[PDB]
Symmetry: T
Subunit: 137 residues, 12 copies
């Protein structure tokens, strides 16, 4: 019924970073989420402690999370441990294809405790992640 979309560091910068901005991204998600009969609560923070607080809320609330954690994907165990609490499905999103880049990008602390992972499908990955969650209730 409710989905939490959580974006980590440097995901404010889309565009600036042919560029669809985060404000547009929120717009998209929220539209494609109203057709699915869902509500999308989309947030972005550069602060790990903020991201954690949001994932705590989703844990207590048992609402599924769609998480594009940015560069913390590859480095953060604190984040992963907060994700591990979640009882509702967790879906890991990457806009770029990470496996086509630096080799250090090919490890994710989050993948192994997520339900599943979408990578390289761009902005639409978010929308697809939504559609998975709609069809699994």
């Amino acid at each position: 019924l409710i989905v939490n979309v959580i974006n980590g560091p440097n995901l404010g910068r889309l565009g600036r970073r042919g560029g669809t901005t985060h404000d547009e991204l929120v717009a998209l998600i929220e539209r494609e989420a109203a057709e699915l009969g869902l509500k999308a609560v989309v947030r972005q923070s550069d602060s790990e402690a903020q991201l954690l607080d949001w994932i705590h809320q989703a844990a207590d609330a048992a609402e599924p999370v769609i998480l594009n954690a940015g560069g913390l994907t590859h480095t953060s165990v604190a984040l992963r441990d907060a994700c591990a609490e979640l009882s509702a499905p967790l879906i890991e999103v990457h806009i770029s294809n990470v496996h086509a880049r630096e080799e250090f990008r090919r490890h994710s602390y989050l993948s192994p405790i997520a339900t599943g992972v979408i990578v390289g499908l761009g902005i639409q990955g978010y929308l697809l992640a939504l559609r998975y969650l709609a069809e699994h209730v």
Copy 2:
């Protein structure tokens, strides 16, 4: 307009392997592909040489491929080299979450030369992969 869905070894065995069989899988894909205005040509082979021949056809034809190559994902460079020819988008599909399993499963020769990757969303990954390709023409 046309999408090639290609399944590698042991993907005949779905079910037998709560189990949705491959025949059902073909049924699904072909239905969700008719709503998208697409045609889905879905095949499965245990033979690498067959898989290659199908990817050659898709290369010459420039039709996008959705490829769940099975255990050849982790081992086959021949396959990857055949995928590399493709001019149309390539999407890598995994039913199980591979990153939640054996560590050797977390390397894919295909990922780095694919457009993108879906993992752990089950049978639906195929359907989502479709939807990406529809929205990108």
Copy 3:
């Protein structure tokens, strides 16, 4: 009651490869298997897709497998995934002592999902593998 003996690539070549040929090997197994009150269905293929099809049959049928997969032992995850289905015991056979050779030979994708492993006892390993299966029904 029935045992499947499956030999992978280059195991046709025994002798040619002091040499007991595969035809002799089949002869042996089938004799020592009649004394044990068993039936031995012994096959050999250079084709992975064939090997898989045979292991599929043994999976559906729930008949134990004795598998000397050759050089695919060290490289094939597809094979291992097909072996993983088996409900009846799986025994991995190696004629040569693999640990006495190249270091890459000392990893087997099959070992960890087999019941057990015989290595370096030559042609007789097959016969011993039989005897294990007889005494465990």
Copy 4:
């Protein structure tokens, strides 16, 4: 004519460790060894220095050894160097399937200087190891 069965540390504890005890194990081996026309001299020690002294005796005497060295398998070069002297066949036995366990268990200092290796066939591995030695004189 004579076979030395040598068990390393913690192999006294079988049972205690559905459990067939070492005393039963000795009983087994000695019975299945009388049918083969062999004599089985079965010993067990937690002391490496004792194990070595027994392998020295077998070296001087040129009597084949069946050796389940326990956790010293994975760690001991001293043992391996004592085994290296043997002129009669050496067979390495493991009750559990070692490759199905911790990854550190998948290296054996003994394997490369043994004639061959049996793993995961339980208590019977000893009996099979016997049968190899009978048929090779």
Copy 5:
């Protein structure tokens, strides 16, 4: 005379994470610390920058620290560098046994610049850490 107990990310969640909550934990520490003739100043933050500021205070003040840094243990050099300043003893605490879990958990940037480490003794580790500090003034 004064001890600083510092808990890192996700240590607010004890219980929720049979569960003794952090508020209970603070209660414990502060009780067992009054019997030892000590004062326990116990804090928790998800923010690394906050944790650092607290460790700066303890550095300037030369008051011993008991630090359970959470998932930052395994990843943070910034934290370790702040701990390195401390002149009073530093004790690293882990509730779970970390060595019994994922292999990446078995490296701690903090251990080598701590006085010592307690792991897997649960909530009591904190109390024991206290008792070390009491007996060493």
Copy 6:
């Protein structure tokens, strides 16, 4: 009610190795163990086979063990396998901070099958280990 304190090689040498000797150590433990309402049975051996025999006794008896195995910590799988039998809690003790020394010292075969680990708190670690066991019956 009874605790087994077991010290491995070179732990006789405390002092000789500002030095509190083992005889003093036994004295300590036995005093702090009488206040806790416990009995401490403290032994030390340079012989692995002896250490194993003591851990066998504790296994059969189901009495908790406090084990400082010395340099066998880092090398011995035989020891670890004997510790694995224990049903009562096992606590691993290190006097020095091992993580502050050679890098090879930072792996312990014992840690992952122990209840927990104390490191770098000196002689007192033993006393703290006691106190854990008292409070957990």
Copy 7:
């Protein structure tokens, strides 16, 4: 015309950490920067999210950055990704010689996407970094 000097965690502590404090450091930079005809905007934060926000400003503004990111150098991909946006030159500064210390300090996520790197020249590295930027406009 304008240079951004950005210092990461624990760089407030210079001195306390023969010690020239950060306030002195700012004093220095700002003096040697007025002789070069430049303006130096020098900031320090323990918060990664703050550091990122400052690097975002420098990215949008296209003003060169001199960045001593502290312990986040060795661990942070989020930081590196924010640095990657910069169009103006980026210079990485280290006061201590990092290659003369722990081996983990010899990898920097920042180096490969920086213009260049100064290491071990102490406080003056900042001043030299300035002088590079003056001579390259």
Copy 8:
């Protein structure tokens, strides 16, 4: 007198893959092989089992092989084991310079059991390989 030229997977695709096709390649080899007084029997297959059967024929026949095994070079031990039988010279051919590409391409299971290796000289490598074999009878 006779040379076997064997091409592995995806070597049908030359051109399609400035492009000289395989049919042209066969044409070349067969021309430059008639001047050398040789006969060239050139085949190509995507099927490993076919490649093996051809190498078996060359083994029995003791006719030298020129082998460009494609992506199976880097992955196949079965192939290597079939090549190992050959008594006549084996020459490994690569059109592209493999060492100038992905790092995984820089290991060949075939190289160590070949007579020698040609890499990066393009289509002509085949012709040079011929010329070696002519001058060595």
Copy 9:
């Protein structure tokens, strides 16, 4: 029109090292190079600085190089950097099959910046390398 053949350390010793000496080698190359319509300028030095000076000349002159750098192949980046300047083709020659020897021999700093590589074809590799260069002008 002109080819530079450059041999590194210990290549004076051919023969001494069934042995064709370097003087013979020069003789060969110069003969097979006159039939190809080429001129071969063949040199050998044990001195890296000399080898570099010769490769500098070939760089300035834009004349192709055939380089058998000896043991500097596996160790020298200085050499590789000098080879990198060359605009004319560079061909790496090895008399022995290097991949059939020590594992450290299987890395070449030169391979990745060469046009191509010949290995294990003996003295003739030089002659083949010539023939490549003739046919590519």
Copy 10:
């Protein structure tokens, strides 16, 4: 008062290698060194033995060295051992950013025994290195 600038192999080639030649480089250094009140003695050699002899002179003389050792940076321990003697400061210079290139370039035997390191600031690094040495007497 005197500074030794020492350039290793292939640093003669600047320009040839938009290009400022070594002769220009010497010109620069010597000018910017006269303003600093210093004398710059700048040399370049492709010969390691020459470089060593120059560093021996600087060692005996106790005059600081600025050393851009070229490709010997990454490979030479002999050089590093000669640098280790120096009592006056040693500064390591790299024109290119080495960390932005091949991964093997990111280890320097010299860095850990140098005072400090400048990398990627081009020709000016030399001038900055000078300025460090002037301000530190």
Copy 11:
């Protein structure tokens, strides 16, 4: 004045292992040690606990040790820790050249805490080790 020669496991077997036996070895050492004005106390044990007890005696007594620890060289930290106590010189002896054998033999826990090491000079290494100790008092 007194030297302790200590031989580890399997060093009883010299000869049996052209063979000079240990009894001869003791004879040698004791003769060449009387000419040097020394006394040689030569012992051998397969038991680590015995070896340790002897090294404890040499530690307390401050008499130099010549130690050929056999296969415990490569595996034993307990031994190394006992050797670390010694105040008198420790010399590590190996009869065979260990670096010419298996790669695992090329690490010695003892080397780094020994005064020095002799390897591959056969039985005489002992005599040379003596001569070092004579000339260093």
Copy 12:
């Protein structure tokens, strides 16, 4: 009858590097070599090409070599290949204990093709190496 003592780079510097100089070293060797009935031809060079030329002479001449190759020990394959020619014994000498230093010092390309190795016995190692060669003719 004749022994070649060859010292590599930076071994001129003994003393300067309590210091016995090389001139003294030559003096020593030549004295202790006259008592042994030998002649010692002792040379030192910083030039690898010189060292090689000397080892070539010893190869042709079949006179044993005592080689302390300095930092080229750890890096040079060219040297090792020149040493490999020698028919007379080769003894590797190190003054310092190399295993007590940097970890990169614990690999020697020379050790595996030497007769044996002396390390950490200082200047006397040379004299002992002599004595080995005297007693082995």
